[PDB]
């Protein structure tokens, strides 16, 4: 889980990031609107890092369990 995978995961969870990214990807809006949405997206991307880092750590923690060591033998 590098930064780009955390952002890819944010792309499908965070409502604010989803709203901004769906708007920026919409054609025929304007130049200034796209620039503003891009800067807000960068701000959310760098802002949200700690929580999704914790989430990814939990995700990796889930596959270290004794249940898997039992299933594999």
């Amino acid at each position: 889980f590098r930064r780009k995978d955390l952002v890819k995961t944010m792309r499908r969870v965070d409502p604010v990031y989803i709203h901004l990214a769906e708007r920026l990807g919409t054609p025929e809006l304007s130049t200034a609107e796209r620039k503003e949405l891009e800067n807000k997206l960068k701000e959310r991307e760098e802002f949200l890092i700690p929580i999704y880092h914790q989430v990814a750590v939990q995700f990796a923690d889930l596959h270290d369990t004794p249940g898997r060591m039992q299933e594999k033998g």
Partner: protein, 761 residues
């Protein structure tokens, strides 16, 4: 316990007077036993006796038998004799017979492996033929009515008698269906009257068999036929839906917890699951007879298919895949619509042309996206002999869509040979062309007046269509035409004809170039010479292509061998699939997903089958197999929904595409029309990388450019439109990767070893 110990077959070895007999014993039911002896099967009706013996029916005669087990002997008593072995028909009885046998197969009671499927196919075929026979419900009606002569009011009995008499007298005739509704009507009318005091109870009780019969045949003989097989598929799902959504232990434990009061139910589930492979063979055979040559599905069949295709457990893949095929197969044209419409337009214009509607009909035929080349080659005369020219103009005008056609002329020879001449050009490609087309009968008029019909740089294009409506046999037709083109070289010495196209009347195209090269073309066969651009096959510039023959010649599979110098050999081999989807433009009312999904999925499955056969039958070690699907018709749909559709379509078979080394795919779809290109990378079947681009034609040249949608521009952003491929595929790509890390490539170890020994010496 695992589901391979609860077995229904026993091997028994009995030695009699030195001769060892190895017998297999299994069952078709709790009481129906099958014994394999000396390679032959015998069916025995076996009933358990309370005294430990068995009651057998073997050859029509009954036997009461016992066994005693000794230290090294089996003492079999039959009647009053001992053998010591050493230890080392009316059409409605057939319905029940075969249906009970098939249900027994569905419940896990199957014949032995060397004998299974030898009789089940016949049970399925006989069930189908019996159910489709109109006289079956008459026999059921006769049987239920004869066993109840009284206790039925005379009015309803007489009405039923009259209706069944009519139906019997109309057997096997158009406009005839079983009168289930009329029997229901008279019974419901008498019930509506509702006579009291023993007219009520007796009537309502003693007519239930007739109500059941009309309920079974409420949808007719064909509906009943379909319903029975649907019931068998429901019996399949009844068991197999319990072994999904988890592991075997989860299923068995959950079944134990749900059925605490009875453990035999759990055992039945496990037992029937043990023989799921044989059940799957029967399920495939049952599906073939339910939704085969009938491209339509009801809202009851669709539920069974939708549940069946969701059996994600791999052991049932055979039944899921075929079910998926049905869901896509029953949304195709039946060729009757195109044949009737095109033939009506072509024949009705001939009597007197220029009524200001037949012109528009021919224009609609030319300007439509739907293929009509399965109907056009059959217009040789049909009766009228003018339709020749009407066909000859349309086909060319339908095929030559990328050409600027400026003149068409009709000419005839002093025979029954019509020819149409065309003059056209390429606006921005290969910088004036001409051509013409003629039709003949059976073979001879082609060669007899070949030089005369030709009288319309080698810019000329000559097409010929001949009426040989029999037996798609590429070699025979190609030899028949090639034998002439190998002797008559008028195509080169007259004025210069670039290519001669041979159209066999569905259409089979054999292109020949009798100018310099051998008169054969394995690469562009079965393609129109005018629509040979509309395959994206010229992109294989760096490959020597070998075409792979296959059945159903709408799919085009090629094996490209990368071009290399006279030194190093070819290491990069790749299978390329090129298919075209032909259909009219769609009108989106939230109902355009079915066309794209079904056509793409059908071509994808056919491509995978042909790739499997081609790949396993050779040894060339391909790496990156590629599939391209051209969606001709225009569709109004947001590209994100097309992304979702192709994501589902590809991910559901990602495991097969991974096994077949299919790594890249390209889908071209015309939106609203502006084409978009979906570039898919499909590695191991967990994730699919879809990149979306539009074709940008807003340039000062004929050059087209890819433009992305902002999100994930990717490698194709700014890529032109049409680029060749090739790579090194191994051995001069891993060497570099290893050198980049400060170590040698592993297969360099022996050579250094040899060289080191030299220094050692």
């Amino acid at each position: 316990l695992p589901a391979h110990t609860l077995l229904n077959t026993v091997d028994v070895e009995l030695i009699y007077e030195g001769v060892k007999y190895v017998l297999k014993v299994t069952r078709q039911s709790p009481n129906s036993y099958v014994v394999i002896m000396n390679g032959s099967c015998v069916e025995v009706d076996v009933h358990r006796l309370s005294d430990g013996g068995l009651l057998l029916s073997y050859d029509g005669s009954s036997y009461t038998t016992y066994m005693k087990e000794e230290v090294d002997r089996y003492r079999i008593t039959i009647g009053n004799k001992t053998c010591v072995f050493e230890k080392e028909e009316k059409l409605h009885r057939v319905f029940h017979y075969v249906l009970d046998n098939l249900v027994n197969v569905m419940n896990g009671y199957c014949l032995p492996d060397p004998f299974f499927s030898s009789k089940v196919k016949d049970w399925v075929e006989r069930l189908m033929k019996t159910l489709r026979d109109p006289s079956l419900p008459l026999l059921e009606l006769q049987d239920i009515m004869t066993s109840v002569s009284g206790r039925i009011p005379p009015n309803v009995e007489k009405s039923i008698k009259k209706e069944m008499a009519q139906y019997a007298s109309n057997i096997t005739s158009v406009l005839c269906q079983f009168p289930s509704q009329q029997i229901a009507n008279i019974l419901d009318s008498h019930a509506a009257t509702l006579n009291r005091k023993s007219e009520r109870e007796v009537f309502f009780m003693n007519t239930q068999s007739i109500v059941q019969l009309v309920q079974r045949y409420r949808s007719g003989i064909r509906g009943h036929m379909k319903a029975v097989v649907m019931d068998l598929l429901r019996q399949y799902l009844r068991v197999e839906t319990q072994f999904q959504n988890g592991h075997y232990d989860k299923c068995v434990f959950a079944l134990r917890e749900e059925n605490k009061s009875d453990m035999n139910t759990v055992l039945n589930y496990i037992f029937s699951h043990a023989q799921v492979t044989k059940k799957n063979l029967l399920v495939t055979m049952l599906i073939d007879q339910l939704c085969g040559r009938d491209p339509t599905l009801t809202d009851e069949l669709l539920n069974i298919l939708t549940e069946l295709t969701q059996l994600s457990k791999t052991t049932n893949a055979k039944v899921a895949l075929r079910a998926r095929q049905v869901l896509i197969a029953s949304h195709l044209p039946s060729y009757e619509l195109r044949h009737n419409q095109v033939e009506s337009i072509f024949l009705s214009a001939i009597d007197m042309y220029g009524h200001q509607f037949c012109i528009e009909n021919l224009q609609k035929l030319i300007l439509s996206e739907t293929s009509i080349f399965d109907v056009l080659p059959n217009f040789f005369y049909h009766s009228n002999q003018v339709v020749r020219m009407a066909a000859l103009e349309v086909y060319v005008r339908r095929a030559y869509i990328a050409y600027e056609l400026n003149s068409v002329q009709h000419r005839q020879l002093k025979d029954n040979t019509c020819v149409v001449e065309f003059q056209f050009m390429l606006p921005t490609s290969h910088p004036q062309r001409m051509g013409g087309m003629v039709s003949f009968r059976t073979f001879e008029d082609f060669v007899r007046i070949f030089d005369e019909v030709m009288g319309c740089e080698p810019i000329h294009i000559l097409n010929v269509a001949i009426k040989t409506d029999c037996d798609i046999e590429d070699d025979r037709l190609a030899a028949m035409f090639r034998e002439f083109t190998q002797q008559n070289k008028a195509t080169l010495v007259d004025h210069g004809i670039r290519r001669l196209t041979f159209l066999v009347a569905f259409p089979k195209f054999f292109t020949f170039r009798a100018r310099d090269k051998f008169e054969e073309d394995r690469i562009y066969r079965h393609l129109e010479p005018a629509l040979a651009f509309q395959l994206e096959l010229n992109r294989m510039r760096n490959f020597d292509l070998t075409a792979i023959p296959c059945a159903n010649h709408k799919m085009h599979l090629y094996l490209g061998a990368a071009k290399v110098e006279v030194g190093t050999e070819v290491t990069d081999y790749r299978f390329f699939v090129r298919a075209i989807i032909r259909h009219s433009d769609l009108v989106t009312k939230e109902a355009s997903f079915e066309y794209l999904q079904n056509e793409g999925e059908r071509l994808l499955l056919e491509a995978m089958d042909e790739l499997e056969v081609a790949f396993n039958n050779t040894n060339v070690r391909t790496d990156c197999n590629h599939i391209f699907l051209n969606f001709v018709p225009t569709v109004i749909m947001d590209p994100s929904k097309i992304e979702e559709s192709v994501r589902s379509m590809v991910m559901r078979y990602g495991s097969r595409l991974w096994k077949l080394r299919v790594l890249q795919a390209e889908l071209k779809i015309n939106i609203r029309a502006i084409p978009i290109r979906l570039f898919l990378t499909n590695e191991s079947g967990y994730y699919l990388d879809i990149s979306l681009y539009k074709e940008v034609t807003d340039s000062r040249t004929a050059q087209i450019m890819f433009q992305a949608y902002g999100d994930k521009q990717g490698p194709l952003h700014g890529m032109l439109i049409n680029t060749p491929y090739v790579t090194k595929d191994l051995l001069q790509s891993k060497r570099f990767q290893a050198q980049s890390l400060g170590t040698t490539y592993i297969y360099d170890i022996p050579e250094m070893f040899r060289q080191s020994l030299i220094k050692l010496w």
